Each structure stands twice: as C-alpha cells, then as structure tokens.
Symmetry: D5
Subunit: 164 residues, 10 copies
C-alpha cells in the first residue's frame, strides 16, 4: 500500500502512448524524474473530461520541472484509444500528450489504495513521486470534484525548492 517516504508501489502495465500505440510502462523507468501519477474513474463518462485534458494540455509545464505525468484507469487500452479517437467537442478526449495506463486487473488502483471495491473503479487519486521513486504527496478526491493543475505545480516547485 501507498505511504509517504516509502517507495511508491511498483507496476508494469500496458498504456496508450501519446502517438496512439500500446506499450508496457514500469514505474521504475521514471527513476531520475519526478512523476505525477493520477487516476480517474471511467472513460466515456458524461463528465466533460476537462480534468484529464487539463493535465494533458499542461505536460510541458511539468516537463520543464523534470516531471513526467501519467494517467490511469481500470478501462482497457482499446477503450483509451477509442476515447482519444473521439472528438473533444462530442465529449471525447481528442489527442493526448500523456500516456494512459490500462489498469485492467485493478491492481495498480488497489496498491495505491484508491479503488472503490463496490464500483470496481478508482477515485480521483493523484500521487507525486520523486526521482528516487519515493512517494512524496497524496491527493484523493471523491468522484464529483476535480483536481488542480496549478496546485500540483505549486507542490512540485515547493518540493524541488526544498531539495535545492
């Protein structure tokens, strides 16, 4: 389970890459970089996916801070792909600048302790992981409330300021 100042739970799982391909991604492959790993409940929700899009539209701000961003849900990689092929205007995801993990077994959500067991979907959890793979901050929102790109960046800069 996920704990501050302990190594963030490991995973190696299929993800939809920004280019549209499927690829296995391990957490340890990010060693040497900061990582913002964030979960969302379901693809194709009647929610306007503004939240997932917001993070994708902002990758480079995180990148300038040596931070990679990674999305995740219990949906398949095909579901992910289909959502990106769908129009943003029509409620789709459109192009993504970040990978989206396909947590098909729900185990990543489980290890990060964000799985709603009765629904089989993940809460809006977000985790900041340092270059050493250490879990440094936990944010978990109930389904109906989104996270803030600004806030995560606030936190990132703060953490990096302390390291300097």
């Amino acid at each position: 389970n996920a704990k501050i100042n302990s190594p963030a739970p490991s995973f190696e799982e299929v993800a939809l890459m920004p280019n549209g391909s499927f690829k296995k991604i391990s957490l340890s492959s990010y060693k040497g970089k900061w990582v913002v790993l964030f979960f969302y409940p379901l693809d194709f929700t009647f929610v306007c996916p503004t939240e997932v899009i917001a993070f994708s539209d902002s990758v480079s701000r995180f990148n300038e801070l040596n931070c990679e961003v990674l999305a995740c849900s219990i949906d398949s990689e095909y579901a992910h792909l289909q959502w990106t092929l769908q129009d943003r205007k029509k409620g789709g995801l459109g192009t993504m600048a970040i990978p989206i993990l396909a947590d098909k077994t729900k185990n990543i959500a489980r290890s990060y302790g964000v799985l709603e067991e009765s629904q089989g979907v993940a809460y809006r959890g977000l985790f900041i992981i340092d270059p050493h793979g250490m879990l440094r901050q936990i944010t978990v929102n109930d389904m109906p409330v989104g996270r803030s790109v600004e806030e995560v960046l606030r936190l990132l800069e703060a953490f990096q300021f302390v390291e300097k």
Copy 2:
C-alpha cells in the same frame, strides 16, 4: 461456481439496454424463460465484433424459443454505450437488440469461472440456463475462436424437445 444441474450463479448488475439506457438486471428476473448468457473479452477490440453482432441479429430466433439472450464483459456501461454509438461499418457495434452487462467488478465472470485473472478479461464463455434457473450447458472458447449461433439454437431445441 457454474455447475450443470445446479442453480446458475446469481447476479444483479448494470447493463446497457437495447434502447440505450442503463438498467440493473438480475438473473432471477428471467425465471420462467431460457437464458443464453455469453461473455466476451473486451469492447473496441481490433476483431470486427461479428460474434456479438451475430447474436444480436438473431435474438428473435432465440426469443420465439422462449429464450432471452444476454451479453457480458468487464467493460463499463459507458464503454458499452460508446461502442453502440460507433458505426458498425467502422468496426463499431451499432444498434444492439440485446442487453450487455457491465461486469465492472469481474465477479460475474468469476462466478461463471470464465475470468482470466492475469488479463482481467473474460474468455468466450456461453451458458444455457433453463426457466428454473438451472445451468444446463457450458461452452468456453479461447479468445481467438468464436461461437456458433446455429449451435446454440441446436442445443436449445434439443433441450426443449426433451421436455416433451
């Protein structure tokens, strides 16, 4: 688990209705009718979903034999809905004449013993259930091979013939 001449495993779960709405469906609500419950692995797969469509195109042939047909997968109801909104020509599902269960918790697949745990997806299992809710026949295919609408009908007629 699913055993011949034992009551078929119970379930009550959200499904995508033929009209496009979401609805809770219980197995017991079919008491008095035959049921063909069949699983498939994933929505939006790169296999043209001929198999699921074949069963939908043939409901009537089951229906006049006092048999209801029910599809199921580990995908969400929103995923299901999205697939039906997708054009059949374009590898989508198009309109569906049968309900599709959203086994988001994988428990239905588990109880029917068709779940591939490592994958998180169900095998191509099909189950014939009588008006008394008794499991009467088991078919399970490996992912790459489809089932036969003709065969299931053969079996149905055979079973009903034995009742007279």
Copy 3:
C-alpha cells in the same frame, strides 16, 4: 481442474483399443497432435449410442486435421469391450475406430470437472487440446443432449486457421 490455456489435466489409464486390446494411454503421448477428448455417462444405456458412434464414424475427418479422438467413461475396459462385441442394430456399439478410456477411479472425470458426484458418472463433456497439450476449448452438455461432430470440426479448423 481444467482451465483454458493451461496444460490439460494429465492421465494415464487403460483403454479399449480399436483392435479390441487393452492398453495404457497417456495424454502426453498425444503431444504433437490435437486431441478431442470426450466423456459420456454409461455403457449399455437405454439411450442408443448414436453420439459415441458418430465420433467413431468420423475419425478420419479429425485425423486429416492432425487430430486424434478419445472417448471416456467410468465403465471398466471389460464393459467397453462387451459393448463393442454387441451388435450395433441391437443397441450395441460395434467395432470402434477410436480408443475408449476406462476411468475406473473416476479421477479423469474429476480432473476435467465433469463428474456428477451423486451419480458417479460423467456429464457429456468434450475438450479440445492442442499439440502443446494446452486446453483450448470446453464443451459440457447435460445428460440428455448430444454434441455435434460438425461443430467440433468447425472449431478445429478455426483454431488451426488462427495458427496458420
């Protein structure tokens, strides 16, 4: 128990050979060939044995597809033999072109999960096993309904088409 894409349960047991002799047969001796292993409840049933005969009459069609066929029941090898010595017109089996396993311990039925424990007899289960010894499809019928030689051949071609 038996599972798709797991090695099919092992066995080494006495069988009635097509020539009329008794012989020990192991599953692994079929490595390199496809196998259709199928169970039936009892020898000498008041149910005419059209089903078992149908598979025997069709061996070559299976053989041409690099597939061996194997029958099985809880009856002794002597019971098997006696049934083949009985005239086909008289409700007997006649000369068989396939071996018939004598599952006297009922353990083969048990491992394939087709044993009706209260009766001590096997359900009409049929299993397709690949040249690697991997279980590839499961069919189980309630006692009163037979299987289809055509259907098994349909699946066999389908499976081989996927490899080629």
Copy 4:
C-alpha cells in the same frame, strides 16, 4: 467403517432384481432377517464367474436359514443386466436368484472398507449381518481367490445355534 457388533454400514442403492428390474434397496429393509452381503470386483471379467453363480445357485439354502443374500459391485445396473442376459456357457452370468447392487458411487464398498482405491474396484469381501442389523462376521479375499458357500453356511448355522 464396518465393525463387529456395531450396526453394519447403511446403504440405499439401485440393484438388479432377480426378475430383471431395477429397484432401490436399503439395508434396513432386511431388518428381521440375516443378510449375507458380498462384493466382487468387476462384471465381464475374463475368468468364469463361478463364485457369484455359486451363491445364486444356493439362495434357498440361505433362505432356509432366514438369510437373504445380496451381491454388489461398482458396475452400473445396466452392466449387471447385460451380464445376466449373457449366456452362462459363454462366460456370462445368466439370470440370477439374488439382487446385485450397483455401487456406482463406490460408497458402499468404501463404508465396508473393501474398496481398492487405486483400481476403483472392491475386494472379494463378504459380511454376515444379523436380524438386528449388527455386523457379525467379516471375510475379505484378495482378487484371485474365491469364497466358500459351504463355509458361509457353516458360519450361519453356528451363529443361529448360539442365539438358540
């Protein structure tokens, strides 16, 4: 398991009746009479079935002593029937003057502790049971050696002489 001066293990099972019909028979239905229950391994064995026949040819001798005799094996009732329809001269059983239990589940053999677990067949066990349902004597032979009708009668008379 079966113990001297304890109630003989209960059973209710299908048997081939002397007239050729199938019938459920319980041990307790013999209360008030002595019973010689005896097991044999298999129907249709290559060795002339003189032993089973010997007991059938002698029923009236047992009946004279208020004793009923009951045969048993792991074979089905249909196997039993078929053996009696077979000519005695030809290695068959001919019509029998005693019922033959069809211990399909093997449980009767198990409870009397005569089941060879590796073979799935019963040893040549014979049990004398009194009118009170109490087990009074145990005889168990290895497969290749038969029992003696004279001896069982010796024992019967001895037991009845003591109760006199």
Copy 5:
C-alpha cells in the same frame, strides 16, 4: 482507517480552544457542518508556522461556507497553549481562531493513516468531511511542503456546488 465515502474515523479528544481553555471535542459534534481536519508534525518547529496560521487567519471564509476547521498534532494541550502564548514574531503561534487537538496517544493520526511511526509525528494530512460525517477528500503532504488555503476552499465550493 480513513476511506473516501466511508464515515471519517471517530475521535473524542482534548483540544486547545480559541479562547485558551481546554475542552473535549468529538468529531460527531460537527455533524451538520463540513469539517476541514488537518494535521501538522510538531509544535515549536523552526519552520515559521505560516501554514497553521494561514488556516486560522482564514476561518471565516470557511465559516461562510458552513465549514469548521480543526487543527491537530501529537503535542499536549499545554504545548499548544504555550505556543499560542508565544509571539508570532518570535516564531510563535500567537492567537488562534481554530481549536487544536492534542492527539497525545497518536491514535487520531493512526486512524487517519498519517502517523510517521518511526518519528512519532503526523504528516501534513488534511481531510474534508461532509455534514453527514463522510470522508470526502484526502490530502497528505510530506513534512517540508505546505498545503493551500485557496485549494481547500476551491474543493469546498466544488463539493457544495455538486450537492446543490
């Protein structure tokens, strides 16, 4: 332990009141109001307690939203009191407009899963609890990075907007 959409872990503990008195406070006494419960590591840290002060300076903004705010640490109520008697200029806490729980047994921190067991102090955890006592959002920061009053208010308004 603390879970989204489950009742927030109960507590009744001594707290330093804004007026300077000690008082037992239970979580359930806030039923009917929103609660922001937030932990901090230690009193008298060489950190300028800007964070704890920031929340105190902002109580009325939370109050206008029907939300009460509650601070907590493993320090005694006397330690709390002493810190408030200390000058803000000298690194003290000065006057507080919010109560500060004295989690002397560390059990509140434990139940909210924010206790650093090796240090015996709590991480910078913050929890939003609804009028029904249900846990609605989790924020946990590593020691050196503070939380944002603005962000918590963002979240509060969002939650209340959904309820309307």
Copy 6:
C-alpha cells in the same frame, strides 16, 4: 486398523510361548519367505472348551507342508499361556502345543490388526493370511461365540498358492 489387503501386514516383535515351553521374541519379518496364518483369540482359560486353538495346533503339519507357519495370539501374558498348556486337555486346558502363542500384553498387535474390542480389552476371533513377501492376503474376523475352520483356511491357502503357480 492398519490391516489392508495387498499392503504389508502390520509389523510386530513380541514374546511368545514356544511349542517347547520356552519364551522367545518373535517378529513377523522372521517369517519372510513363508506363508503365515496369524490368528487371534479372546482369552486364556475361558469357559469355552478351547477346541479352536487346539484344532489349529493339531493341524500344523498340514499348514507346514504348504510352506505355511501358524501363529496364535491373545492379550494374555506368556505365563498365562504357559499355565494353560500345563493344564490337562481333558480338564479344559490347552495341553502341549505345536504352535507358538504370542503374548500381546500391550494390545498393540490386536490394535494394528484392528481386532481389539476396546471396551473388553480382548481380541475378536480374527485370522489373517500373510504371503512370503509379508503382504496381507486375506482377512477373517468372527464375533466371539463362533469358531473358524481349519479346512477353510487350508482351502484358501491352496487357492492362493495355485494362483502363484499358474
């Protein structure tokens, strides 16, 4: 009861009254290479005139010329057994014997052969045929009041040996 057909007959090494009147330790394995008829009886000095035990003793040679040794057993001490043999046959005693009699003082032999009546502390009239390989080949158990047949055991022996030959 450990006593199972086609399994090695339960082992034992115990004091026995020898035909000559001496006490001697006897193990089952010492009979390897010979058939053995091991038979139990309830008690020495019983009010049942001991014809059964005597019958087997009077017939040893018949067993012996079948390459079969015969061995009696009961829960009584070796001294009890000896006393019984010193007692006159006419007078309800045993007389001198042609077979050894095991003194199953711990009752464990009877236990391992599953013939011990636990409430009484005595053995049922159990008889066991053991082959030259030490394998248990046939089980006979009688309730107390009914005896076994020397003829029958010989019938069985010949039958078993006939199967070995052909």
Copy 7:
C-alpha cells in the same frame, strides 16, 4: 497419573474375582465409608512364588477390624485370576483368596494410578491407601522385584486413624 494425595482417588468400575469364586463388577465408590488398601501386582502365574498377594489375603481381618477393605489388581483377566486360585498354593498357585482381585483388562486403572509400565504392559507393585471419603492418602510404589509389608500398611492405617480421633 491422576493419583494425587488429598484428591479423590481415581474412579473405576471393573470385573473382579470375588473370594467365593464368582465374577462381579466393583466400583471404588462402593467402598465410600470405609478405608481401602488398593494394591497392584504385575502378573499372574509368575515365577515369583506369590507370597506378597497371599500375605495380604491371609491378613484381611487385620485390615477389616480397622474398618479397611483390601483390594488386589492386575492386568490379567478374571479367568486368569480364577485359574490361579484353583491352583494349589504348594505348587506355586494362589489358593482360595479372602480378597477380591480386579481384572484390569484395559490397563486403565493401572494408568490412572500411574503404575503402568507401558513397555511391558504390566503394573508396578503400587499400593494406595484411600480414606472413607474416597480421598487418596498415601502412595507406595515398588519396582518389580521387591515386595511390600503388611505390617507397614497397618502401621500407616493406625497412624491415619489416630490422627482422625485426636
């Protein structure tokens, strides 16, 4: 061993050879209201001339006039016991006895009194003094080859009864 000083002596109900020659069930509790000397010995018909058991039988009245009953016990059957009494005293037998002899066929009595030699299946020369209330009051246990003293047991009895009085 359940046998503890100032605890109720271990219960039993078992067949015994009565002084008159009959078999009878005897329970410990049937002696309530009397002192009891219960004593064990290893085996009937031993090559030890049975002076010890005889000594206690020859002295019953001495125990009796102390309101004390005496009871012998061994793992031998009641038939063994009877046979021994039918045997002539001169000839190494027991002769007719003035005390009952328990037939501890299941060995449980010896077990509960903690005097059973498990490897031999026989009891040590244990002797137990039990009061009218059924309470165990003294324990004597001898190795096989050494006998007990009738005088000593009487010494003990008088001592115990003297303490009751004054």
Copy 8:
C-alpha cells in the same frame, strides 16, 4: 516427573551440612551409592520433629548398606540452620547427621511430584535411588503420618539382595 526405573530427577541445590556449613549438593555426586531422599513440609512445625530426627539418628545403618540419606524442604538454609541450633528438648532439631536441602525454588519438590501447590510445601515423600541414579521406589505420605526407618531399611536390604 519421577518414575520407577527412570533416572531420578536431577538437582543441584544449597544444603545445610552436618557440620553447620552451607554447600551445593548435586544428585549425581551420589552416583555409586544408594540414596534415600526424603521430603518434609516445614521447619519449626508445632509437632515434635521425631521423623527427621529418626533418620538422622540412624544414618550409620543406611551407611552400612552403602546408602546416603538426604533431607529436603522448601525452607531456606538459614531456617534449617536455626532449627538445628534450637534445642531438641525444646522442639528443635539439634545438630543433624544428614544434609538438609533448601528447596527455595520449590523445583525439587515439583520434579519429584510431592509439592502441595496450594500450600507451597512438600508432602512426606521418600525416594530410594540406586548407585546408577535410577529411581527404585516411591513412598508418599499425607502430612500427619510419618515414615518408618525400619521399613526403608527393609526395602534397602531387599533391593541389594536382588542385585546380589
């Protein structure tokens, strides 16, 4: 615990020596000699200590038979000493010709199974041990009844006569 023909329970403990000194004494130091080890309840009991004295007055009789005698109780060595300094006429012990063990831990009494647990004192137990350290006879008296020096000597001579 102590058993006939098993090695007598070991001990090494302080004892009051006949000369008035304290000394550690082990059971094994008597190997090669017979030992009469005997327990008594308490020092300074209101009843004239004739029993302990009787054994002391008779040591040479035991010594003649290559037998050493050893007294024991739960009292301290100082208690023992004090009792011997007390005048025999006055209810005291006087100087003893045998050692008296000070079983302060109660463990010797425990291992010889003579400890009255509720009182914390030992029963009047006496044990005869051979030159090989084997326990050869057990005598245990209830508190109010003494043992006999004559009897123990009777036993000793008997045992030695047998080994002769």
Copy 9:
C-alpha cells in the same frame, strides 16, 4: 501484576500477628485505610534486620496518618514466629508491632512483581496503597540496600496533602 492507579493485587494469606497468633489477612480488609505493604527476602539472614525493625518501631507514626503497615516474605508463619522469639540483640527480630505475611506460595511476591525467580525470594519492594485499594507508589530495592521510613512518611503526607 501491579500498576499505578489500578487496584493493588488482591491477597488473602496467613500472617504472624503482633500478639503472636496466626491469622488470615486480606488486602481488602484494609479498605478505608492507607497501607504500606513491604517485602523482604528471608528470615534469619546474616544481615541484621534493622530495616524490618525500623518499620515496626515506627507503626504509630504511620497509624497517626491513617496508614497500616504490613510486612511480607516467602518464609512460613512458623519461621516468622521463631524469629520474633529470638532476641533482638542476638540478631533476632523480637516482638513486632506489625503483622508479617507468610507468602508460602510466593504468589503475593509474584503479583507485586518483586519475586526473584531464580532465588525464590522477594526483592525489597514497598508499595503504598490508598483507602480505595488503589496502588499509588512503587519502590523496589536490590537486596543489599534498605528503604527509608522517613521517605515513606514523606510520600504519605504528600499523598494525603493532595487529597486535602
């Protein structure tokens, strides 16, 4: 075991009364009074008994403060008695003004956690118990160092001052 502000461990045990008689004394019989219960190792020690005597010589000072004093050791009541009959000049105890418990089972020492298990004797433990039977202070000395009557009185007054 014994704990501050928990009821002091119960006991009912024989004690040597100041008048020279034996009497059962329970802790609860002191309810309504303060109690100083103190242990010492052994009677008749080569260590002059100044400590035990000091407390006896001072009873009244304790009594005036509504406090009873109680001595205890693992020695028998007869040992106690004998020590008091011994002349104080001669290393004896003399007439005592306090009762002395005879903890023959060592259980009182055990429950107060002052038993030296290897020696079977108690450490120089002293316990102050209030009128409610609550344990209020613990003093435990290693064998060679005595306690102070003054100190115990200092504590007693202090405790009573806090109630008044």
Copy 10:
C-alpha cells in the same frame, strides 16, 4: 521490561543537551558510570516544575558520585527546548544542567513500564542503573507526588558503599 539485576532496557534517542543542541543519546554510552534516569509526564504543566529543576540544580552531587542524571518525557525536543527558553520565574524550566530525552515514540517509557497508555504520558518513574548497565532500583510515583533528590543520593551512596 525493567527488572532488577537485569540489563536496563536499551535506548538511543534525541535529547536536548544542556548547551541547547539536539543529540542522539544511547544508554550504553553511559557504561562505566551510574545513571539516574527519571521520567516526568508533560512539559509546560501547570505544576511549577520544581522536581525536574531540583535534579538539574543538583547534578554535581550526582556527578561527584560518578553518576550521570538523565530526564525524559514524551514531549518533542523542540518542546523541551522551548521550555528551557522560558523564564523559570514564569513557570518555565530555565537553563538545564542535564539532558532531557524526547521519547516521541513513547517506547522508552514503555520499556521501563512507566507509560500510562490512556494518557499517553509517563508516570514519575526513576531508575538507578549501575556502571555495568544493570538496573538496580525502581521508584514510581503517581503524577501528583514528587521524588526526593536526597533519597536518590541516599540510595546511590548505599549502593556504592556495598561495592566496598
């Protein structure tokens, strides 16, 4: 736990040094010296901390007896520091001549068995430890009653006198 004549429970913990710095201190670092380790409940209590001050004012008296003195409580090192910065006249601690352990995890209190679990604070326990690290005396007071510097010195001198 803390037992007389057993090694005193080990610890290594942060302490406030007399100079005002924080430093890790282990018990074993005192090997070769006597140690008076004493606990108190809480910093900033409304009791004028005369007791802790009394020991600090007297270090020298311990020091010349080759004895180091060590204070301890469950409060943080920062709490300790703050209390020493507070004016003695104002109920503060003022300058301290002894180190004060910060038992933030309450484990030292636990191992010395002085912790009041419900409170989360330690009782007024004091422990004398010899140069060999052996626990030699235990004093435990209920919260409202203080210990005596004189008494501890009495004990120290007594212990050292026994060593010569």
